[PDB]
Amino acid sequence: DRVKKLINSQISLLIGKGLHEFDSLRDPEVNDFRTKMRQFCEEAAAHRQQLGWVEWLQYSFPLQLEPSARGNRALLVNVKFEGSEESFTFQVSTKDMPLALMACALRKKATVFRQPLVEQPEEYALQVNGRHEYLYGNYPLCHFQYICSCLHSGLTPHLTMVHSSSILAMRDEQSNPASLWSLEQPFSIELIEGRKVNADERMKLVVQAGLFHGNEMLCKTVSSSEVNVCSEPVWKQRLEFDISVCDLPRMARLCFALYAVVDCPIAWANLMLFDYKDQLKTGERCLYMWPSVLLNPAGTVRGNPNTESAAALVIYLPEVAPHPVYFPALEKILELGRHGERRITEEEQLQLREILERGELYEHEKDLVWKMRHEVQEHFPEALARLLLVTKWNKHEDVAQMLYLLCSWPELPVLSALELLDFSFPDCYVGSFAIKSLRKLTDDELFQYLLQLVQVLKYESYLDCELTKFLLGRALANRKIGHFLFWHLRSEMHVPSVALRFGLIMEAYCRGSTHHMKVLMKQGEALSKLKALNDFVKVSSQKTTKPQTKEMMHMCMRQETYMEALSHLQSPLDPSTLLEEVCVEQCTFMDSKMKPLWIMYSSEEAGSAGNVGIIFKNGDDLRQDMLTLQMIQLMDVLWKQEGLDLRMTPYGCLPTGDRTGLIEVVLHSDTIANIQLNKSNMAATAAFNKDALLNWLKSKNPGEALDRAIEEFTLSCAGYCVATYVLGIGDRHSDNIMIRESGQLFHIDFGHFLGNRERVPFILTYDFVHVIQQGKTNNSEKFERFRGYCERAYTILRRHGLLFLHLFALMRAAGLPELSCSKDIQYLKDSLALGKTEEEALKHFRVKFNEALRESWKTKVN
Ligand SMILES: *C(=O)c1cc(-c2cc(-c3ncc(CN4CCN(C(C)C)CC4)o3)c3c[nH]nc3c2)cnc1OC
């Protein structure tokens, strides 16, 4: 019908690529992915349209619980019924559950409307006012994030009784429309010609090619002869590799590098030896090369789409048989793997136990762990990664006996599985195994590691893969996973190397949720408008005064195309947050280089909670900032699970397009720089500039409120000192540190991390030390209490050291200039002192903390 056509065009504008372009490729791998993933995604949609009303609440509005609650006191709550202005305020216990609260609200309604109610508390859920958030399930009220948030800021929770019939109606409204192993000859290729090559004509062209299984070489690299620099070089050379065709692992990649010599690299191109159908590739192949910025094994195996500019390499994959050759099926693999030999003294078992309880190892150590592989599966299953790295992947017989053990290997913990997703484990069965051990991930853990999982999609060799199906299935089952999966993919559509894979996943997702595609379209339209408004602000700020640019901005925003496009949307930063009425008079732009837009919203239905802001930033790369903020959030989750709340501010930061993204406004907060200006006729005007920040906290927090504000400052200070030390956040100054009116300190503008290469020391600023000490010169009772907070925070993070290392290792796929090699992850190994005992790492940390105090005292002596 006309609808199928309309949806296809809406998908096209949403993903930023015409769907006709996918068909124009005439690519069988692309075509098969589209068919298969459309089928799988529409199955999910059908499953969803029949969920029960509580199950549909778990899809659309997943519970936001406190980290402590995963796996008393008096409380005032305001409850109202859907479509009623009359509300009931009643005292409840933080230990009470939503059903008791609901049954209580029903009894009030029954007395108020003088009628015993047929409705039972079991037929309801409590919505947070003007938000896509709900309180339901068997959990005390204090376990919910919203109730927890209300208790700390003193404020009263405002809840609406929503009946099942209204929830079911939402579900209804949102429905989709109605053999190789005998081939002993050495692997070889033919390097035919080069096309569109650009280099210095004094030099000569060389083609270096190597066979890789992930990062490791399957044999030594081979180099073609030197041929004089020109546009179309003609080699005609049969390059031979020291590896039998029978020994090529399934995931073997042929990597090429084209360079000029008198060392000047021109381009690179990679390709999988076996196709997506496991057939050994033969024939002629034109490799549209990528411009180099050594060989590039981790780089994409798909050719450069820019066929006009790109230099091309013509190669010939020889026909090794008169019939097609496929990689042997698992049944053939396991049949060969079933046969081997298992058997050395207790002293040699202790040698194996010492190495497996540790990490690089010698060649004699490799020989021991390989022969003892059966004992590895039997007594140390979590050491699979060590055994997988000692497996000789260039020996088809060794690969077979490894796979035999892996196929009966027990499911490993989530920490172990995340390590197996790294590019240093390129086997498909290994990747299928890791995905299997990751199905046990809770939606909360999945959401926490979604950014890393999206990045390891760039390591994939084929379109249809276990990770894609896993991410699609989880996104289709949880709307928040879906929302964030879509944005992570959409923000990378300008990267030609991922635009095809990422575009195809988003299309598949869209087939899974027509309604959500429309909701995301509403977000893309606002972001389109924001870009146009920001471009304008940029040029105006360069010509006239700030009040003049601000007034022109407001007039442009007051156009109906802008009022419609910027209003009534779900926030890309948090689909729970609804951005209702754009507050034009409160909108402005900041004075920094990119003139970022400061956009405010209000919602009568949400009250004070509806007053939310977004920062539109265009011109900067926000990926590193988002990663740093997600890591600080992880620390906060890890500190909270051990009962330590350091009052952190991990505000939203989401890239949405090319050098484009949104940042969450933290209201009632100013930078340390703005507070320290010490302006005249203010409630905080100081006698000593050292008093300015404490005077400001006093003006915001009168009487008893001050002690709480200083404690919030101390807690947040300790968390950020540890966060910035562990992560190597340098270039810290008064204009990238902010303070909230509650006393909470937080950092912004995370341009540089991991010491990028200098060792970032522990930092203690005197201005903050002065606040922690309550404005007293000596207050060791409060100072040492802060030092205990730092040590406790540091100690907790170390216990989770391997979780940070694994996540940051997966993030290497993002290609962030500050996260691109082994030395970057070494910085975290050093900061977290993982090569030490807790006692030794605590002395190490104390020696670093005492050194920061002596630094801070250069300002105390002044
Ligand atoms: C890029 O621009 C960027 C921005 C943030 C980020 C900054 C701020 C922030 N910076 C200064 C101020 C304080 N100021 C108070 C007064 N109001 C006006 C409207 C009266 C303007 C702001 O705020 C910020 C505040 N809340 N969230 C924020 C984020 C972080 N990272 C950036 O680039 C990576």
CSV table of N, CA and C in Angstrom, one decimal, residues 538-620:
chain,number,residue,atom,x,y,z
A,538,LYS,N,26.0,31.8,15.5
A,538,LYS,CA,27.4,31.8,15.2
A,538,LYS,C,27.8,33.1,14.4
A,539,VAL,N,27.1,33.3,13.3
A,539,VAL,CA,27.4,34.5,12.4
A,539,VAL,C,27.0,35.8,13.0
A,540,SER,N,25.9,35.9,13.7
A,540,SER,CA,25.4,37.1,14.4
A,540,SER,C,26.3,37.6,15.5
A,541,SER,N,26.7,36.6,16.4
A,541,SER,CA,27.6,36.9,17.5
A,541,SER,C,29.0,37.5,17.1
A,542,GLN,N,29.4,37.3,15.8
A,542,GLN,CA,30.6,37.7,15.1
A,542,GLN,C,30.3,39.2,14.6
A,543,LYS,N,29.1,39.7,14.6
A,543,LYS,CA,28.8,41.0,14.0
A,543,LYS,C,28.2,42.1,15.0
A,544,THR,N,27.2,41.7,15.8
A,544,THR,CA,26.5,42.6,16.7
A,544,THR,C,26.7,42.2,18.2
A,545,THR,N,26.0,42.8,19.1
A,545,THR,CA,26.1,42.6,20.6
A,545,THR,C,25.3,41.4,21.0
A,546,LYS,N,25.6,40.8,22.2
A,546,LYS,CA,24.9,39.7,22.8
A,546,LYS,C,23.4,39.9,22.9
A,547,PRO,N,22.9,41.1,23.5
A,547,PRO,CA,21.4,41.3,23.6
A,547,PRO,C,20.7,41.3,22.2
A,548,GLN,N,21.5,41.7,21.2
A,548,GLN,CA,21.0,41.8,19.8
A,548,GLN,C,20.9,40.4,19.2
A,549,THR,N,21.9,39.6,19.3
A,549,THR,CA,21.9,38.2,18.8
A,549,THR,C,20.9,37.4,19.5
A,550,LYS,N,20.8,37.5,20.9
A,550,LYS,CA,19.8,36.8,21.7
A,550,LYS,C,18.3,37.2,21.3
A,551,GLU,N,18.1,38.5,21.0
A,551,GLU,CA,16.7,38.9,20.5
A,551,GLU,C,16.4,38.4,19.1
A,552,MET,N,17.4,38.3,18.3
A,552,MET,CA,17.2,37.7,16.9
A,552,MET,C,16.9,36.2,17.1
A,553,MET,N,17.6,35.5,18.0
A,553,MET,CA,17.5,34.1,18.3
A,553,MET,C,16.0,33.8,18.7
A,554,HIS,N,15.5,34.7,19.6
A,554,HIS,CA,14.1,34.5,20.1
A,554,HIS,C,13.0,34.7,19.1
A,555,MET,N,13.3,35.6,18.1
A,555,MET,CA,12.4,35.9,17.0
A,555,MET,C,12.4,34.7,16.1
A,556,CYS,N,13.6,34.1,15.8
A,556,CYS,CA,13.6,32.9,14.9
A,556,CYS,C,12.9,31.7,15.6
A,557,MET,N,13.1,31.6,16.9
A,557,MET,CA,12.5,30.5,17.7
A,557,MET,C,11.0,30.7,17.8
A,558,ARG,N,10.5,32.0,17.7
A,558,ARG,CA,9.0,32.3,17.8
A,558,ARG,C,8.3,32.0,16.5
A,559,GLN,N,9.0,31.6,15.4
A,559,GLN,CA,8.4,31.2,14.1
A,559,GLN,C,7.7,29.9,14.4
A,560,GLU,N,6.5,29.7,13.8
A,560,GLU,CA,5.7,28.5,14.0
A,560,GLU,C,6.4,27.2,13.6
A,561,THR,N,7.3,27.3,12.6
A,561,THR,CA,8.0,26.1,12.2
A,561,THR,C,8.9,25.7,13.3
A,562,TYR,N,9.5,26.7,14.0
A,562,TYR,CA,10.4,26.4,15.2
A,562,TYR,C,9.7,26.1,16.4
A,563,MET,N,8.6,26.8,16.8
A,563,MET,CA,7.8,26.5,18.0
A,563,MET,C,7.2,25.0,17.9
A,564,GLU,N,6.7,24.6,16.7
A,564,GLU,CA,6.2,23.3,16.5
A,564,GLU,C,7.4,22.2,16.6
A,565,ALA,N,8.5,22.5,15.9
A,565,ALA,CA,9.6,21.5,15.9
A,565,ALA,C,10.4,21.4,17.2
A,566,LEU,N,10.5,22.5,18.0
A,566,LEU,CA,11.3,22.4,19.2
A,566,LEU,C,10.4,22.0,20.4
A,567,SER,N,9.1,21.9,20.3
A,567,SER,CA,8.2,21.5,21.4
A,567,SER,C,7.8,20.1,21.4
A,568,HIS,N,7.2,19.6,22.6
A,568,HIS,CA,6.6,18.3,22.8
A,568,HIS,C,7.4,17.2,22.2
A,569,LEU,N,8.6,17.0,22.8
A,569,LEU,CA,9.4,15.8,22.3
A,569,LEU,C,10.0,15.1,23.5
A,570,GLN,N,10.4,13.9,23.3
A,570,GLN,CA,11.2,13.1,24.3
A,570,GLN,C,12.6,13.6,24.2
A,571,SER,N,13.3,13.8,25.4
A,571,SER,CA,14.6,14.2,25.3
A,571,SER,C,15.6,13.2,24.7
A,572,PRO,N,16.4,13.5,23.6
A,572,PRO,CA,17.4,12.5,23.2
A,572,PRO,C,18.4,12.1,24.3
A,573,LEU,N,18.6,13.0,25.3
A,573,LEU,CA,19.4,12.7,26.5
A,573,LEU,C,18.8,11.6,27.5
A,574,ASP,N,17.5,11.6,27.6
A,574,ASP,CA,16.7,10.8,28.5
A,574,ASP,C,15.3,10.7,28.0
A,575,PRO,N,14.9,9.5,27.4
A,575,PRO,CA,13.5,9.4,26.9
A,575,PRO,C,12.5,9.5,28.0
A,576,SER,N,12.9,9.4,29.3
A,576,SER,CA,12.0,9.6,30.4
A,576,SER,C,11.6,11.1,30.6
A,577,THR,N,12.6,12.0,30.2
A,577,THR,CA,12.4,13.4,30.3
A,577,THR,C,11.7,13.9,29.1
A,578,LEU,N,10.5,14.5,29.3
A,578,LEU,CA,9.7,15.1,28.3
A,578,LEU,C,10.0,16.6,28.2
A,579,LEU,N,10.3,17.1,27.0
A,579,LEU,CA,10.6,18.5,26.7
A,579,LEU,C,9.3,19.0,26.1
A,580,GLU,N,8.5,19.8,26.9
A,580,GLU,CA,7.2,20.3,26.5
A,580,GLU,C,7.2,21.6,25.8
A,581,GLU,N,6.9,22.7,26.6
A,581,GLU,CA,6.9,24.0,26.1
A,581,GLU,C,8.3,24.6,26.1
A,582,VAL,N,8.8,25.0,24.9
A,582,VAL,CA,10.1,25.6,24.9
A,582,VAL,C,9.9,27.1,25.5
A,583,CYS,N,10.7,27.4,26.5
A,583,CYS,CA,10.7,28.7,27.2
A,583,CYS,C,11.6,29.6,26.5
A,584,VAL,N,11.2,30.2,25.4
A,584,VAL,CA,11.9,31.2,24.5
A,584,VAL,C,12.7,32.3,25.3
A,585,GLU,N,12.0,33.0,26.2
A,585,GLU,CA,12.6,34.0,27.0
A,585,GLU,C,13.7,33.6,27.9
A,586,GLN,N,13.8,32.3,28.3
A,586,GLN,CA,14.9,31.8,29.1
A,586,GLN,C,16.0,31.1,28.3
A,587,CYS,N,15.8,31.1,26.9
A,587,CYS,CA,16.8,30.5,26.0
A,587,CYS,C,17.9,31.5,25.7
A,588,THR,N,19.1,31.1,25.5
A,588,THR,CA,20.2,31.9,25.2
A,588,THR,C,21.3,31.1,24.6
A,589,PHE,N,22.5,31.6,24.6
A,589,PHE,CA,23.7,30.9,24.0
A,589,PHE,C,24.9,31.2,24.9
A,590,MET,N,25.8,30.3,25.0
A,590,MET,CA,27.0,30.6,25.8
A,590,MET,C,28.1,31.2,24.9
A,591,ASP,N,29.1,32.0,25.5
A,591,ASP,CA,30.1,32.7,24.9
A,591,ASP,C,31.4,32.0,24.4
A,592,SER,N,31.4,30.7,24.6
A,592,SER,CA,32.5,29.8,24.2
A,592,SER,C,32.5,29.8,22.6
A,593,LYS,N,33.7,29.4,22.1
A,593,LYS,CA,34.0,29.2,20.7
A,593,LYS,C,32.9,28.8,19.8
A,594,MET,N,32.1,27.8,20.2
A,594,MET,CA,31.0,27.2,19.3
A,594,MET,C,29.7,27.8,19.6
A,595,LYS,N,29.6,28.9,20.3
A,595,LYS,CA,28.3,29.6,20.7
A,595,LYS,C,27.2,28.6,20.9
A,596,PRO,N,27.4,27.6,21.9
A,596,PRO,CA,26.4,26.6,22.2
A,596,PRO,C,25.1,27.2,22.7
A,597,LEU,N,24.0,26.7,22.2
A,597,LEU,CA,22.6,27.1,22.5
A,597,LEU,C,22.2,26.5,23.9
A,598,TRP,N,21.5,27.3,24.7
A,598,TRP,CA,21.0,27.0,26.0
A,598,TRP,C,19.5,27.1,25.9
A,599,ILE,N,18.9,25.9,25.8
A,599,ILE,CA,17.4,25.8,25.6
A,599,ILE,C,16.7,25.3,26.8
A,600,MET,N,15.7,26.1,27.2
A,600,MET,CA,14.9,25.7,28.4
A,600,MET,C,13.5,25.3,28.0
A,601,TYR,N,12.9,24.4,28.9
A,601,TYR,CA,11.6,23.8,28.7
A,601,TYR,C,10.8,23.9,30.0
A,602,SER,N,9.5,23.8,29.9
A,602,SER,CA,8.6,23.7,31.1
A,602,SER,C,7.5,22.9,30.8
A,603,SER,N,6.8,22.2,31.8
A,603,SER,CA,5.7,21.3,31.7
A,603,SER,C,4.8,21.6,32.9
A,604,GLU,N,3.6,22.1,32.7
A,604,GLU,CA,2.7,22.3,33.8
A,604,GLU,C,2.3,21.0,34.5
A,605,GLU,N,2.1,19.9,33.7
A,605,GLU,CA,1.8,18.6,34.1
A,605,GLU,C,2.9,18.0,35.0
A,606,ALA,N,4.2,18.4,34.9
A,606,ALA,CA,5.3,17.9,35.7
A,606,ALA,C,5.7,18.9,36.8
A,607,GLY,N,5.3,20.1,36.8
A,607,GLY,CA,5.6,21.2,37.7
A,607,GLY,C,7.1,21.5,37.7
A,608,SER,N,7.7,21.8,38.8
A,608,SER,CA,9.2,22.1,38.9
A,608,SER,C,10.1,21.2,38.2
A,609,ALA,N,9.7,19.8,38.2
A,609,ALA,CA,10.4,18.7,37.6
A,609,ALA,C,10.4,18.9,36.0
A,610,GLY,N,9.4,19.6,35.5
A,610,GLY,CA,9.3,19.9,34.1
A,610,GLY,C,10.2,21.0,33.6
A,611,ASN,N,10.9,21.7,34.5
A,611,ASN,CA,11.8,22.8,34.1
A,611,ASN,C,13.1,22.1,33.9
A,612,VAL,N,13.4,21.8,32.6
A,612,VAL,CA,14.6,21.1,32.1
A,612,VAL,C,15.2,21.9,31.0
A,613,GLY,N,16.5,21.7,30.9
A,613,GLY,CA,17.3,22.4,29.8
A,613,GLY,C,18.2,21.5,29.1
A,614,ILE,N,18.5,21.8,27.8
A,614,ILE,CA,19.4,21.1,26.9
A,614,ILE,C,20.4,22.1,26.4
A,615,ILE,N,21.6,21.7,26.1
A,615,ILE,CA,22.6,22.5,25.5
A,615,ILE,C,22.9,21.9,24.1
A,616,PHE,N,22.7,22.6,23.0
A,616,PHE,CA,23.0,22.2,21.7
A,616,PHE,C,24.3,22.7,21.3
A,617,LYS,N,25.3,21.7,21.1
A,617,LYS,CA,26.7,22.0,20.8
A,617,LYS,C,27.0,21.4,19.4
A,618,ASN,N,27.5,22.3,18.5
A,618,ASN,CA,27.9,22.0,17.2
A,618,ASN,C,29.3,22.6,16.9
A,619,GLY,N,30.1,21.7,16.4
A,619,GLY,CA,31.5,22.1,16.0
A,619,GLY,C,32.5,21.2,16.8
A,620,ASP,N,32.1,20.6,17.9
A,620,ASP,CA,33.0,19.7,18.7
A,620,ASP,C,32.6,18.2,18.6
